[PDB]
Every structure is written in C-alpha cells, then in structure tokens.
Design a protein around this ligand. Structure first.
Ligand code: CFH
Ligand code: CFH
Ligand code: CFH
Ligand code: CFH
Length: 6
C-alpha cells in the first residue's frame, strides 16, 4: 500500500 501525498 503506497500512501498518497497531500
Ligand atoms: O502496494 C504494493 C504491495 F501490495 F504492497 F506490494 C506495493 F508494492 F506497491 F507497495
Ligand atoms: O490517505 C490520505 C490521502 F488520501 F493521501 F490524502 C492521507 F492524507 F492521509 F495521506
Ligand atoms: O486516493 C487513494 C484512495 F482512493 F483513497 F484509495 C488513496 F489511497 F491514496 F488515498
Ligand atoms: O494535494 C492536495 C489535495 F489533497 F489534493 F487536496 C492539494 F490541494 F494540493 F491538491
């Protein structure tokens, strides 16, 4: 699972 970037 690759986290998103805000
Ligand atoms: O989501 C993938 C998984 F499932 F963990 F292998 C990734 F390698 F990209 F992290
Ligand atoms: O999962 C959220 C997302 F979607 F990437 F914005 C978090 F901000 F936490 F990364
Ligand atoms: O935008 C993605 C979603 F859709 F929520 F899965 C993330 F995982 F990055 F948050
Ligand atoms: O990355 C932010 C988000 F999360 F999409 F709202 C930005 F506002 F910068 F687009």
């Amino acid at each position: 699972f690759v986290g998103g970037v805000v």
